[PDB]
């Protein structure tokens, strides 16, 4: 009965979630904070960015730089300005699925910020921290693939978006979408690993160039590969497909970057979802 038209050009929205907790899982919250920095430098408003992060890293007693979170040795503080929509045990299936669906009544804790999107809007979902057919939540119950796909199908039915890009960093990340995500939903998915592979961590203690102050890994290989790609050039000149082929080639030695769902959605430039940093205009992707 509802209308599929609106007088809006289209707003960029994002959901960023680190599914883990504990100081040793520093990498997942750093990844999600680095993605937030990419979005706000691209003009995505805080009001449209839903952040799920346990928030036990920046001021952890073990953190050598309190108030700071970095996602690469010698990198910049990515914790600065990150909204705190769902922190602690408010990062769960109930709140995560209600946020994607956009049901404020289903939210049991947290900010209550959900994807109250409209037909011309674009959604970018990024999850960091997996097993065959499931991805973690800081505490049990975990997020099972069938539940995530039921929510994405309910969201597709509403027609409250033009297109959605879902990036998953986890082991067996592909298993969340393989043979489940129907085409026609306008949802493109990119995963660090296929349904049967584990995913690599990077920026870990061990190499002689690692900072002595840190005892934890700063990032996840696929995440830092695509995040460092987004910071380097004008995202209006690089498509999601061009990023997929770049990261897939760049980390082929570790895992197989896989794509699922509505593949033609990947024809859009990354700026459709992330905007672009006005300081990177004179740097085109070649």
Ligand X SMILES: *[C@@H]1O[C@H](CO)[C@@H](O[C@@H]2O[C@H](CO)[C@@H](O[C@H]3O[C@H](CO)[C@@H](O)[C@H](O)[C@@H]3O)[C@H](O)[C@H]2NC(C)=O)[C@H](O)[C@H]1NC(C)=O
266: which 2 tokens? Answer: 């990947």
- By CB under 6 A, tell whether 93 contacts ligand X: no
Query: What is the C-alpha to C-alpha distance for residues 226 and 190, in angstroms, rounded to an integer?
Result: 11
Q: How many CA atoms lie within 13 A of 133 on its CB side?
A: 4
CA 92 to chain CA centroid, nearest Å? 16
Q: Is 186 exposed, middle or buried (0-12, 13-18, 19+ CB in 10 A)?
A: middle
Binding track, positions 251-270, relative to ligand X; x by CB under 6 A: -----x--------------
- By CB under 6 A, tell whether 59 contacts ligand X: yes
CB of 125 to ligand X, least distance (A): 18
Among 2, 3, 105, 282, binds ligand X (CB under 6 A): 105
Q: Which stretch binds ligand X (CB under 6 A): 59-67, 128-136, 140-148, 276-284?
A: 59-67
Pick between residue 23 and residue 210 the one whose CB is nearest to ligand X.
Answer: 23
Pick between residue 38 and residue 168 the one whose CB is nearest to ligand X.
Answer: 168
Among 131, 196, 232, 267, binds ligand X (CB under 6 A): 196
82's CB contacts (< 8 A; 6+ apart) are: 33, 36, 51, 53
Query: What is the C-alpha to C-alpha distance for residues 129 and 189, in angstroms, rounded to an integer?
Result: 16
CB of 98 to ligand X, least distance (A): 7
Nearest to 219 by CA among 78, 85, 55, 60: 78
- By CB under 6 A, tell whether 197 contacts ligand X: yes
Query: What is the C-alpha to C-alpha distance for residues 15 and 48, in angstroms, rounded to an integer?
Result: 8
- By CB under 6 A, tell whether 195 contacts ligand X: yes
Q: Which stretch binds ligand X (CB under 6 A): 52-60, 116-124, 162-170, 230-238?
A: 52-60
Among 43, 64, 81, 106, binds ligand X (CB under 6 A): 106
Pick between residue 161 and residue 285 the one whose CB is nearest to ligand X.
Answer: 161
59: which 2 tokens? Answer: 């001021």
CB of 195 to ligand X, least distance (A): 4
């Amino acid at each position: 009965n509802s209308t599929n038209d609106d007088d809006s050009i289209g707003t960029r929205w994002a959901v960023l979630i680190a599914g883990s907790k504990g100081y040793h899982n520093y990498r997942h919250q750093a990844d999600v904070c680095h993605m937030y920095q990419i979005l706000r430098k691209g003009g995505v408003k805080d009001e449209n960015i839903i952040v799920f992060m346990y928030d036990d890293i920046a001021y952890n007693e073990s953190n050598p730089f309190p108030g700071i979170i970095i996602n690469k040795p010698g990198g910049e503080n990515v914790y600065k300005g990150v909204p705190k929509d769902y922190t602690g045990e408010d990062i769960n299936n109930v709140n995560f699925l209600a946020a994607i669906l956009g049901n404020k009544s289903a939210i049991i804790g947290g900010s209550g910020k959900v994807l109250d999107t409209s037909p011309n809007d674009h959604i970018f979902i990024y999850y960091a921290x997996g097993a065959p057919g499931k991805i973690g939540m800081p505490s049990k119950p975990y997020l099972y693939a069938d539940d995530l796909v039921d929510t994405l199908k309910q969201k597709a039915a509403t027609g409250t978006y033009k297109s959605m890009v879902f990036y998953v960093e986890a082991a067996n990340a592909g298993s969340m979408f393989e043979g489940l995500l129907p085409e026609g939903t306008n949802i493109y998915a990119m995963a660090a690993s296929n349904s049967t592979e584990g995913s690599w961590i990077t920026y870990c203690p061990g190499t002689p160039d690692f900072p002595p102050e840190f005892d934890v890994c700063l990032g996840d290989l696929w995440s830092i590969t695509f995040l460092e790609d987004c910071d380097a050039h004008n995202l209006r000149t690089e498509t999601v497909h061009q990023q997929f082929e770049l990261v897939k080639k760049k980390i082929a030695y570790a895992s197989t970057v896989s794509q699922y769902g509505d593949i033609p959605i990947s024809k859009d430039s990354l700026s459709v979802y992330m905007g672009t940093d006005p300081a990177n205009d004179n740097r085109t992707f070649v």
